[PDB]
Amino acid sequence: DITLLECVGKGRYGEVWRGSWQGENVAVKIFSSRDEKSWFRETELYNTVMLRHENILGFIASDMTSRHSSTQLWLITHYHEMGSLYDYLQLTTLDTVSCLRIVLSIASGLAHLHIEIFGKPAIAHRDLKSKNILVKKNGQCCIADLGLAVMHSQSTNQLDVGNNPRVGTKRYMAPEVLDETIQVDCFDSYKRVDIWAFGLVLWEVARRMVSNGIVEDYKPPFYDVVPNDPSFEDMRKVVCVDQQRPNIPNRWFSDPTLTSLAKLMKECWYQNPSARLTALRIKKTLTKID
Amino acid sequence: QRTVARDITLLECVGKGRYGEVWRGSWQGENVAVKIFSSRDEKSWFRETELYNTVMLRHENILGFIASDMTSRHSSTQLWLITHYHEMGSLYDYLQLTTLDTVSCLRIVLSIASGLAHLHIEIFGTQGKPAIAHRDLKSKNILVKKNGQCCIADLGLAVMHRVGTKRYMAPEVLDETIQVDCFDSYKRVDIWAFGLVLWEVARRMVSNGIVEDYKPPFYDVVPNDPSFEDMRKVVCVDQQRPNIPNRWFSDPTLTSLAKLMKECWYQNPSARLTALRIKKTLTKID
Numbered sequence A: 001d002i003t004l005l006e007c008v009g010k011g012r013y014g015e016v017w018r019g020s021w022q023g024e025n026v027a028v029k030i031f032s033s034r035d036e037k038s039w040f041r042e043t044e045l046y047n048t049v050m051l052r053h054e055n056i057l058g059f060i061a062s063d064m065t066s067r068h069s070s071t072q073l074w075l076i077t078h079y080h081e082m083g084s085l086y087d088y089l090q091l092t093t094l095d096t097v098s099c100l101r102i103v104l105s106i107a108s109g110l111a112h113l114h115i116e117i118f119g120k121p122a123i124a125h126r127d128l129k130s131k132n133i134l135v136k137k138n139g140q141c142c143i144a145d146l147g148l149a150v151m152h153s154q155s156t157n158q159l160d161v162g163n164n165p166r167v168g169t170k171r172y173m174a175p176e177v178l179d180e181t182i183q184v185d186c187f188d189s190y191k192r193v194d195i196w197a198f199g200l201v202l203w204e205v206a207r208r209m210v211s212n213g214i215v216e217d218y219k220p221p222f223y224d225v226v227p228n229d230p231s232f233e234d235m236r237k238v239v240c241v242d243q244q245r246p247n248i249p250n251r252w253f254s255d256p257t258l259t260s261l262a263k264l265m266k267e268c269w270y271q272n273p274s275a276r277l278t279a280l281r282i283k284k285t286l287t288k289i290d
Numbered sequence B: 001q002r003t004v005a006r007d008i009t010l011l012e013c014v015g016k017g018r019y020g021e022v023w024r025g026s027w028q029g030e031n032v033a034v035k036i037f038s039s040r041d042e043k044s045w046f047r048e049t050e051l052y053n054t055v056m057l058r059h060e061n062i063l064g065f066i067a068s069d070m071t072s073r074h075s076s077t078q079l080w081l082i083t084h085y086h087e088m089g090s091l092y093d094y095l096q097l098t099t100l101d102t103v104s105c106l107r108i109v110l111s112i113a114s115g116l117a118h119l120h121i122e123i124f125g126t127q128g129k130p131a132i133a134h135r136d137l138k139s140k141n142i143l144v145k146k147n148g149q150c151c152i153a154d155l156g157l158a159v160m161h162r163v164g165t166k167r168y169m170a171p172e173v174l175d176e177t178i179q180v181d182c183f184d185s186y187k188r189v190d191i192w193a194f195g196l197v198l199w200e201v202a203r204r205m206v207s208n209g210i211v212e213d214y215k216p217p218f219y220d221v222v223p224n225d226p227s228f229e230d231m232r233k234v235v236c237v238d239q240q241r242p243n244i245p246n247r248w249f250s251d252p253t254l255t256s257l258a259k260l261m262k263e264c265w266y267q268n269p270s271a272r273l274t275a276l277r278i279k280k281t282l283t284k285i286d
């Protein structure tokens, strides 16, 4: 039995509800009929028992229901009342400890996705962004929305790109996604798209960390250089034509933590995808930063 | 706000196999059938789910879809398919202990042909559908409804435009000559299997006080759980086909059905009747 209590999000994706189940809050996503291939892909990903991780949104159930010509598509997960990282960063500043806890937790989730377990295939997310990261009461985050994920098994030489014509959130798309030169039959290509997007999320978080009494306001990546509601071509212009990267506020260079983070986000943003850091290397670097 | 009642009471197990189990269940005011998949057969749940996420099939001669459910457990994933419940059970079951008259035999086989033609046909536009081949048609995958018509079940191996049951495999599957890049190839494999089902049913139709006992196709030439090689020798090398008893040739309906089944069993897949032509032929019998 589930009771739908309130809508906590509505968009082109569908809707998410806070519900009650066995006396616990749960999140219930009802997909738009336009996004049925995301529902199925997310269901394929959550079939993997060894996907479970403290920094990946926890799955409870997936349903496809129908009577007559009407179909409903449901995903039920754990509920995080603090909401997404995008929501959280607009109303909170961070100290060093909280900033590093958040970004290490995301690195930990992403390295868990990317690294094959011999089981869980290697997984690239393809739509990493601050709205797809939830904040937990322990100060860590978990990564959500596996509808665009790609899976790879090294042991069997199999690449499963799925069938979904959805593309990533335009603001977070890597240069090779925006210029459509990405190597679509290469698993490493998709991991390197995630690394680009992770760099952008690092920047979004680091802006909110106070140093020397200074903090930046929350802004999304490329807020200063594209229109509101940027198109694919708007993003291609700034990233591929103009070679734009998010600006590093000069106040960061007075703080050792933010100086380390600036270095790390620049190594996520090389135009050459093979130059970018791995998720494991980011996790190891953040583990060593204080 | 909205209560989403998902509790299904599993009341009795009506099937157990390598596939997993089927249960009669209760949801609210509907009996439902619940297929709980074995780990062995997880791909069948994914394929049927992917198909129903692509096209919501609705046809009187297709087992009615209700839900696909995936539930997280401590150490495993539980996969359920929920459908309409047909208390009379499978055609295989039904033919063991029931004989048929002319009307009941024709109603059964025309309903199966109707369901199969619906799968096979591509319909264009909104409320259309891709062409579908079943790939495991047999009497255990057909349910009997109270109104005398049947419905086709189990789209776990279906293809849209982990091998089928060996006893029902067409010669081109057994000799590995099937044109695997040609969608029509898969329709023609279903037609072969349909012809075998038509033979199983026709045997149980009474004429002049005579009926055959229920037997499965090739019961007289292969063992139980026949091997791939056993089937290939019968169907491909020796080119055997099920026996038509002499008593059929005294009955106009069984004479017509014998001709139909032989046009489903040509070695050359492209010579076989289409499901639509089978329907037309069946509507002109009696």
Ligand SMILES: COc1cc(-c2cncc(-c3ccc(C4CCN(C)CC4)cc3)c2C)cc(OC)c1OC
Residues within 6 Å of the ligand: A065, A066, A067, A070, B027, B030, B066, B067
């Ligand atoms: C999955 O299966 C079963 C489901 C249900 C069921 C329960 N609540 C609500 C609904 C429903 C209401 C309204 C719409 C539409 C109406 C028109 N437009 C506005 C789009 C929305 C759709 C669906 C249903 C269909 C009942 C069943 O049996 C009686 C089911 O079968 C077991």
Ligand SMILES: COc1cc(-c2cncc(-c3ccc(C4CCN(C)CC4)cc3)c2C)cc(OC)c1OC
Residues within 6 Å of the ligand: A008, A009, A016, A027, A028, A029, A057, A075, A076, A077, A078, A079, A080, A081, A082, A083, A084, A087, A131, A132, A133, A134, A144, A145, A146
């Ligand atoms: C990203 O993706 C998925 C997310 C979730 C999910 C899980 N816990 C909590 C939430 C949430 C709750 C509340 C808010 C607040 C934020 C501030 N604002 C002013 C009011 C609303 C935001 C977010 C969500 C959205 C579930 C999903 O599936 C069931 C997701 O899809 C995989």
Ligand SMILES: COc1cc(-c2cncc(-c3ccc(C4CCN(C)CC4)cc3)c2C)cc(OC)c1OC
Residues within 6 Å of the ligand: A063, A064, A065, A072, A074, B002, B003, B004, B005, B006, B027, B066, B067, B068, B069, B082
């Ligand atoms: C998640 O899981 C299961 C759900 C159900 C089920 C139970 N009550 C009501 C529903 C329902 C149907 C349809 C709508 C429509 C209403 C109008 N429109 C604008 C959008 C949505 C709402 C609610 C469902 C789908 C049954 C199950 O089993 C038979 C489920 O488990 C497989």
Ligand SMILES: COc1cc(-c2cncc(-c3ccc(C4CCN(C)CC4)cc3)c2C)cc(OC)c1OC
Residues within 6 Å of the ligand: B014, B015, B022, B033, B034, B035, B081, B082, B083, B084, B085, B086, B087, B088, B089, B090, B093, B140, B141, B142, B143, B153, B154, B155
């Ligand atoms: C072929 O495959 C599927 C079949 C079904 C299904 C649907 N209605 C009814 C049944 C059934 C009910 C009752 C009896 C017995 C019980 C009492 N008596 C001793 C003889 C009759 C047998 C069978 C089934 C098995 C559901 C499925 O999925 C949920 C199937 O898989 C796609």
